[PDB]
């Protein structure tokens, strides 16, 4: 079960955007020279701190990370991430301890929303929100959670 993580500036580390809960801290760096308040992170790495063991890893390669497309699992074992390229999109789930990819799924052309309930995927929309879609499909986040 994933809960949304807000990604905000980290005072003390110039150009660092991140957030955390009891279990996991996620961090990007902003290499965009023009915007001091980005919405996306094209350039890796992504830093994941496993706050239980106190170790860290790095996601070294990856599609453009959506700020506020970041979700942490209840057990703290998984991190869910929205990653796009051009007009493609996908939801990737990573192992918070090893940074390994655990599940990938194409989401291209769909509008989307996740919460504790699951994943909602809509076609034929008329706005940014998935509730604007004439077709809405529920998909299980269990293969992302692996609990």
């Amino acid at each position: 079960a994933f809960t949304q993580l807000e990604i905000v500036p980290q005072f003390g580390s110039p150009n660092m955007f991140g957030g955390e809960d009891e279990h996991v801290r996620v961090m990007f760096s902003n290499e965009d020279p023009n915007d001091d308040n980005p919405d996306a992170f094209p350039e890796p790495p992504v830093y994941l701190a496993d706050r239980d063991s106190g170790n860290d890893c790095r996601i070294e390669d990856g599609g453009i990370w959506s700020r506020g497309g970041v979700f942490l699992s209840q057990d703290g074992r998984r991190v869910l991430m929205h990653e796009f390229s051009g007009s493609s999109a996908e939801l990737v789930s990573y192992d918070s301890a090893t940074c390994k990819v655990v599940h990938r799924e194409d989401i291209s052309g769909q509008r989307w929303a996740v919460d504790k309930d699951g994943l909602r995927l809509g076609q034929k929309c008329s706005g940014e929100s998935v509730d604007s879609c004439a077709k809405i499909v529920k998909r299980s986040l269990a293969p992302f959670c692996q609990t």
């Binding site: 965009d32 020279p33 023009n34 915007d35 919405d39 996306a40 094209p42 350039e43 890796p44 390669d61 990856g62 599609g63 453009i64 959506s66 497309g69 990653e83 796009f84 390229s85 051009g86 007009s87 493609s88 999109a89 194409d106 291209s108 052309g109 034929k124 929309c125 008329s126 940014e128």
Partner: protein, 147 residues
């Protein structure tokens, strides 16, 4: 500047809707169709994937995105484009500072979300991901637009 006729064509084609229902800003192929129709520049038909196929046949292609900015600053319509597995992407290239000293500024709508969109504030390297951005093809129209 000289490339103004194109930036104007972009700014106006943004809130338009080439495809009856879906707004241009949520459809990269629809936005390019609106810009080119304003400028009177013949465009291949179909989705982004079909358009790129179409450009590769008739339109001459440039060696680099740096060279794309050169043609763009000269008032030439320049389309950056990469074929997808199902959803390809296409963008208008405009003059201005190159991101990472390599990738040209752009205007494009995107079904991915606001993240994938650019109103001249993101380069093709901030729209396409790390892997993709180096596989882009840059196509230019034979004749000038603002001469």
């Amino acid at each position: 500047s000289l490339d103004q006729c194109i930036v104007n064509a972009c700014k106006n084609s943004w809130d338009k809707s080439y495809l009856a229902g879906t707004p241009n800003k949520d459809n990269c192929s629809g936005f390019v169709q609106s810009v080119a129709a304003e400028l009177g520049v013949p465009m291949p038909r179909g989705n982004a994937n079909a358009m790129v196929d179409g450009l590769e046949q008739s339109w001459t292609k440039l060696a680099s995105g740096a060279e794309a900015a050169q043609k763009a600053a000269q008032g030439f319509l320049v389309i950056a484009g990469l074929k997808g597995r199902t959803y390809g992407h296409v963008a208008v290239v405009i003059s201005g500072p190159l991101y990472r000293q390599k990738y040209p500024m752009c205007w494009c709508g995107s079904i991915a979300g606001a993240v994938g969109q650019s109103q001249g504030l993101k380069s093709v390297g901030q729209v396409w991901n790390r892997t993709d951005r180096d596989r882009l093809n840059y196509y230019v129209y034979s004749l000038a637009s603002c001469s």
